């Protein structure tokens, strides 16, 4: 066994600066959300827009996770619960969480 | 004259003057004050209707700022529009 | 003189309710609200016209501005109100 | 298979590790996908309206940064 190795992984991911989620499913999700509501066919996405949107989404998610984890350890437990995240979204504000 | 050409209540001349003096653009079109008058009329009508319903619910014909606060908070889109502003003499919602 | 929007708020109030009234404090609230919303819509239209190298504020600009600024079904009613109003204005 | 299922459990797990989370739950993998969909939809709505205002049949990174600037959380790097 290699116990307590997760902390080093956390340090690595704080050290790294690359995108965490892959490119193809996020791009397909972008195409699907596009054709889901625009009521039009064949809307093209430039290359920089995809990677920019992915970087922004990962930034928003990591901010939400660090805030939620702080308020969970404030509550008295080290496990993140979805009720805490939903509470976090409305405790941040209209522009900060939504 | 040609004031109430759009059949609305807001003046086309004042909003045109405000757009020309606000320096938002070099030139301004002619349908834009009409469109602005329509949207301002619709929003004001909605908020005054909700305030009138709240005041009728409170058995008062003189709408006080508390009634406007209830009219804004009882709806769901109005708070998303006015989340960045607050109302003077406005109490908090009854939890 | 002083610029205000008191008469138009009074007109639409008496049109939607022929009995109710608005206090003087609430009248100023409505005036400041109208000014703030008008400034927001105007700033949005200004930056959107700057983003397409256009020096004119057409009906397309104001519609796109009010759609991306007003969320919800109120936007879908307001666009119909504006299009109906401009057709009513140009129908002379 | 739904496309939102493409956001794998290790992907959100690595997101949480970068966020500083030690232990994660089970419903996290179902709620985070929903909030990511909501956030992305709110951005993409502003972006596609920005495209539709102009005579463009396609989106670009300019509309994206316009959408994020409109929402408040601005993003640098792609403004030129």
């Amino acid at each position: 066994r290699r116990r307590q190795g997760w902390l080093k992984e956390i340090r690595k991911l704080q050290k790294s600066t690359h995108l965490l989620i892959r490119k193809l499913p996020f791009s397909r999700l972008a195409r699907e959300i596009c054709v889901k509501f625009t009521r039009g066919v064949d809307f093209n996405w430039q290359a920089q827009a995809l990677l920019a949107l992915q970087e922004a989404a990962e930034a928003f998610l990591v901010h939400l996770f660090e805030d939620a984890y702080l308020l969970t350890l404030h509550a008295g437990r080290v496990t993140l619960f979805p009720k805490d995240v939903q509470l976090a979204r409305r405790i941040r504000g209209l522009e900060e969480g939504l | 004259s040609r004031s109430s050409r759009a059949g609305l209540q807001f003046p086309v001349g004042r909003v045109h003057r405000l757009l020309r003096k606000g320096n938002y653009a070099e030139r301004v079109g002619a349908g834009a004050p009409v469109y602005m008058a329509a949207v301002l009329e619709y929003l004001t009508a909605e908020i005054l209707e909700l305030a009138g319903n709240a005041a009728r619910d409170n058995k008062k014909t003189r709408i006080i700022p508390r009634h406007l606060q209830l009219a804004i908070r009882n709806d769901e889109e109005l708070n998303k529009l006015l989340g960045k502003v607050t109302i003077a003499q406005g109490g908090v919602l009854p939890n | 003189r002083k610029e205000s929007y008191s008469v138009y708020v009074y007109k639409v109030l008496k049109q939607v309710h022929p009995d109710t009234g608005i206090s003087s404090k609430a009248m100023g609230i409505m005036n400041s609200f109208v000014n703030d919303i008008f400034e927001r819509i105007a700033g949005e239209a200004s930056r959107l016209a700057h983003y397409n190298k256009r020096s004119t504020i057409t009906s397309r600009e104001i519609q796109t501005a009010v759609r991306l600024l007003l969320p919800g079904e109120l936007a879908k009613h307001a666009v119909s109100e504006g299009t109906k109003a401009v057709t009513k204005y140009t129908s002379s | 298979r739904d496309n939102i299922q493409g956001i794998t459990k290790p992907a959100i797990r690595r997101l949480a590790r970068r966020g500083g989370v030690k232990r994660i739950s089970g419903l996290i993998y179902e709620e985070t996908r929903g909030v990511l969909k909501v956030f992305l939809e709110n951005v993409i709505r502003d972006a596609v309206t920005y495209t539709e205002h102009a005579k463009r049949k396609t989106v670009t990174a300019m509309d994206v940064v316009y959408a994020l600037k409109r929402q408040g959380r601005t993003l640098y790097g792609f403004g030129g």
């Binding site: - | 708070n79 | 009613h77 | 929903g34």
Partner: peptide, 18 residues
């Protein structure tokens, strides 16, 4: 002109997960 009938969602925000 029909006037919109409103409803109260479980969570205050307009967006609803479904």
């Amino acid at each position: 002109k029909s006037r919109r009938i409103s409803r109260r969602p479980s969570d205050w925000w307009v967006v609803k997960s479904e």
